[PDB]
Symmetry: C4
Subunit: 332 residues, 4 copies
């Protein structure tokens, strides 16, 4: 083996990230303004805009979830607060019209009760929110939830980074599979644990397991530009979950911060020291203030529509069949 | 597939850009001063110098087009102004002697009338100027133009980045094919839409479709150094179109700008916010002031001549048969 | 041969370093808190924590060796001082309870007497400490030591970077093989001599020679983050030796340094000008002050435990069978 | 072809430079102090130290040539001055004992007379000094010189970057072949002409043509560290020619320069604007002042000796058979 040892499977793959690829233009009859951006969040739920906001306490509380749903996407409420408070945020969203909402639960002691309270509150999507869903504890939770409330509530499981892990969630009964181990902007899983999978390759691998079972893949983490959304969907994801890109918006939690004459908002990992208040796997930082969510979403969707125009994709389903070119370091 | 999924065509190619390759020296009897730099702009039109200026409102108006033609190249007049004004710039050039001139048209409402006015004004080359020529609307325009004024006017179509798109323009009747989706210095197509193709690979692919039909390829965008011109032509292009490299010249539109004791001129994408005055696919910036066009062209052609000396190329046609070595990140 | 010449063996391999790979998550029933971090330092000696401190005069004297052993690892005492002083540091450690300790010897004039004095002082591990163990002088020393004190003292040999060199040390009778030629943070072997081997590939190659003989590999040098420890062990090493990561600790030798309002400690190669007081193969620098060793070790082991959780590794032996994904420049 | 077009020979090779490779350690009985550093400069001339100074007017005049010869290497006198002055510098060196000296000539009008005057002055080596020796004008000069003064004077030809060019010089009768098109520190051939060849691959290719005919290769340009000398010789070169590494020495021409409290000397390409006093293919810069040549050479040779120790090379001939590992961007 050219890279060492005698085992060709030791280094199993070459992992590509968003900056490693570009979408190739293709024959097109599609104007960007006329493209159809709708896509499956889960087997049953279709969104007008294939974007969901991260279950983080500096991204999504009731305000964000309401704005996201009104923009045609959805918010996933974070779970870093008492169960009664999360359920109360679910209610607040549902009382603002017939708006879709999801909410994160863990696999811990009180996870099952949290889930039951959220259902009672009228939640549409339950997200089993973990760093590593390839764990019998996570797969059991996913299964237990689907068998209990599956008729009324869609159950998302995550996160995974390999084909085998996505396959296990599919078998456990997941209505969607969330992909991303290591790629988050505030993530230090890669440096702390040495663990991860570049996101384009992880999406391609997860989609190979999920698509044949009609299970949508949510691409979660590592998205920096609107063009990365197009790339994630062309790799086969059906939606993208955004943290950093939305953390600087008016609707996110947290106050405005002024440093050196410029405006910021705090953005922090759920595995950072201050969020857990131990070995942190996230940092605390700031992102530029971006103004209203509606503006940000408009530019993101605008970029998506441009990609759909370039690739001749009339629908997201068509975009998922687009081709890439791999680029070198010099490209960029 | 080592990079993910089971489809080997999903990532179709490894795209190389100018910084990824060097020209290999070869046996030579050619002195740089004696090389023949002439080359086909289109099937019918040969230039003394294989360089054309970009159809941008910070690069080419009448003054640039006159200087470019006198230097042995050609200018393509931008179309960001009323039809009567563009036609008046065409006249202004033709009244400055028997100088070649081209002019951009789009595919929009008034594109056909613009084209007719330009012809009446005496234009030599019509450039169907789009970000994505692989669109039936663009191919139709190219065809409609060639069938109407083809005897008197050469019709360029662009831009493309793939072999199939170049082939479609050839069949539509293009007299030259312009290559470049994503590589412009002021371009944000890559980050906004996630779409593009590294320019050496795009030229190689387009030339594979065009050369067998005797259709010249214009390499458009991404050229930073005189050595990049040599590389573009050795990849098989017949001419290079330059924006950034000429935007800092006395003959370009726009005034001199002083910042921190240094001289600049504004240079902006035609898809930037201020040029369109929406989801911009270009930025606005500045380039260093370079002095007279004649000086810049002299150094560019000087570099080209040096490359022709190193590669034993007596003509541009010979240079198109030169070989590359691929380099690594460390090289550079 | 695509890279030049006609000999495919001239460039024998593509060497990967820690930043070139990530650990892939795998099916897991392992909680980080419950993972077993114990591992073989040598054939006979198992540590509770697979970490040893570098035999450097800015890393390990008696204080460090005591702290390291109490934390479940071990220190290797540096040999840059009189033999009687090194032996006195060995005694000092052994008088602080039943704590494991090792000590470096060279291959020079007084190396054999140093070794004998260390044994008399009660040392547990002798480390034949060289930059290049593939030297008959080093192999002879290793052999001579093992045949003389082998029943009572474990003999480590190093350093190596190739499979053949590790194999030679195994045959010489080494109880562990230390891997790393070129990767140290303060190392200039690579720039001064042009010699080295990227550490993941060197570990994989050394383990291919050592593992079939039940000889543990110590990964020495180049480790920057806790995640690198996980990667080194997954490549097949049984322990990691740390210099830079521990040089900033309270227990390391040297005083606190204040520069620009921040706290540092000096950290220098044993082959630097000031350590040898000639052609230096190390530099002198500073690392940030890190506080007590116990804190640093806790975070390092925490990262290791996280990796074991992600990879489903209940033991270090299991972690050694984990898989990597190779990443590109863009990843990082 | 994965990188574009249908011609696999269009991109002929992947070119590696010094930073792309490391020397692999090997079994060794060689102490650095005992290695034999002597090597062939030409078929007939062996140097004690395999280093020659560049024929540049900021590197080698009489003073440098004398110091270089006394250190066991040789200087090549630059040709940027009247013929009588160059010949007078040759005399000055020969009058300082039985010291070897070489001198550059071109292929121009007065090149032949320059060569004759140098011979009369007692020169030992004539270097036909060009940027591209694969030119019948250069090959003719090499041949004409060898057939005229070949019994008394060794004739070097250069520069080349390909196997075929080296082969042509061998057939022309060169006593040594100098390799390097594009790699010089002050070189802009790569950016101006887009032409070049990464130096490790160029050396490997040139040696494939020269070694079977017993013709030594001089590696010229791109050497930044003493470790690069070892790498150049292990690729198969017999000597290295140094510009930047020696330009900062007391013995080089030019005065001391003080900027921001630090000491420098000017270092400039022979193809820079100021050296030619047009399309320059070199820049003018400064390098740090390094003190006496003897110190610099000592450290360079020290690094070489270290490499010989690591690779088990008792002679330069043995070092030429050493193996490399290719490294990634992350390595470094
Ligand atoms: C550090 C951490 N561990 C867990 C976790 O769930 N651990 C766990 C997993 C399986 C299990 F059975 C029992 C516990 C979580 C949520 C976190 S987090 O707060 O930092 N959030 C994320 C989310 C997504 C990520 C992708 N890469 N890294 C990520 C971190
Ligand atoms: C953003 C944009 N879209 C179009 C465009 O023509 N859209 C379109 C295409 C086909 C069609 F049928 C209908 C409309 C244009 C001209 C532009 S531009 O002003 O920014 N100019 C260019 C030019 C070259 C480029 C290469 N990569 N990106 C480029 C942008
Ligand atoms: C520069 C140097 N040479 C030797 C050395 O032992 N030389 C030698 C080797 C075999 C022999 F038979 C006779 C002498 C040592 C210890 C050193 S050091 O002080 O700088 N330490 C290390 C340690 C680890 C390294 C990995 N890469 N580089 C390293 C340097
Ligand atoms: C720019 C230039 N051209 C020539 C030259 O000889 N031209 C030429 C060649 C063949 C011929 F028949 C007639 C003329 C030279 C010397 C130079 S230089 O002054 O700049 N020196 C070098 C030396 C080494 C180089 C490697 N890459 N680039 C280099 C430049
Ligand atoms: O603390 C953390 N460490 C690692 N990943 C996190 C952490 N907190 C949230 N994440 C994940 O990172 C995603 C956001 O990534 P981003 O959009 O690149 O900022 C989230 O949706 C989570 O999957
Ligand atoms: O706004 C824009 N976005 C992307 N490409 C543009 C834009 N405006 C002009 N271009 C293209 O970029 C070329 C100039 O590229 P440059 O020479 O690298 O500066 C032009 O000839 C166009 O093809
Ligand atoms: O001077 C030196 N030059 C090269 N390597 C050294 C030197 N001194 C110590 N080392 C090695 O570098 C290791 C520490 O590397 P680090 O943990 O990356 O700082 C040590 O354990 C030695 O193997
Ligand atoms: O002006 C120039 N342009 C390109 N190469 C040059 C020039 N002048 C000298 N050289 C070459 O660069 C070598 C020195 O390279 P360096 O050691 O990397 O600085 C010289 O020996 C020449 O071969």
């Amino acid at each position: 083996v050219p890279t060492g040892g005698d085992d060709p499977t030791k280094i199993a793959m070459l992992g590509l990230t968003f900056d490693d690829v570009l979408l190739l233009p293709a024959a097109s009859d599609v104007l960007p303004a006329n493209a159809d951006t709708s896509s499956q969040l889960t087997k049953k739920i279709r969104l007008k805009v294939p974007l969901v906001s991260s279950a983080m306490d500096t991204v999504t509380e009731a305000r964000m979830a309401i704005a996201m749903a009104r923009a045609g996407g959805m918010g996933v409420l974070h779970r870093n607060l008492p169960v009664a408070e999360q359920a109360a945020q679910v209610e607040t969203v549902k009382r603002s019209g017939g708006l879709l909402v999801g909410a994160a639960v863990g696999v811990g002691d009180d996870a099952w009760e949290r889930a039951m309270a959220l259902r009672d509150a009228g939640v549409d999507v339950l997200v089993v929110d973990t760093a590593h869903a390839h764990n019998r504890k996570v797969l059991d939770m996913v299964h237990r939830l689907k068998t209990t409330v599956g008729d009324e509530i869609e159950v998302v499981g995550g996160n995974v980074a390999t084909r085998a892990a996505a396959a296990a969630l599919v078998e456990a009964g997941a209505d969607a599979v969330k992909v991303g181990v290591g790629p988050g902007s505030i993530c230090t899983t890669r440096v702390v644990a040495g663990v991860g999978a570049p996101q384009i390759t992880a999406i391609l691998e997860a989609v190979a397991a999920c698509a044949p079972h009609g299970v949508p893949v949510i691409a979660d983490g590592g998205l920096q530009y609107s063009g990365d959304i197009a790339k994630a969907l062309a790799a086969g994801a059906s939606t993208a979950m955004l943290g950093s890109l939305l953390a600087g918006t008016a609707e996110s939690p947290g106050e405005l911060i002024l440093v050196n004459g410029k405006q910021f908002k705090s953005y922090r990992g759920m595995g950072s020291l201050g969020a857990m208040q131990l070995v942190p796997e996230g940092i605390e930082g700031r992102v530029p203030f971006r103004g209203p969510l509606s503006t940000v979403i408009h530019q993101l969707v605008g970029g998506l529509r441009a990609a759909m125009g370039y690739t001749g994709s009339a629908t997201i389903e068509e975009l998922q069949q687009a081709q890439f070119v791999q680029i070198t370091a010099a490209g960029l």
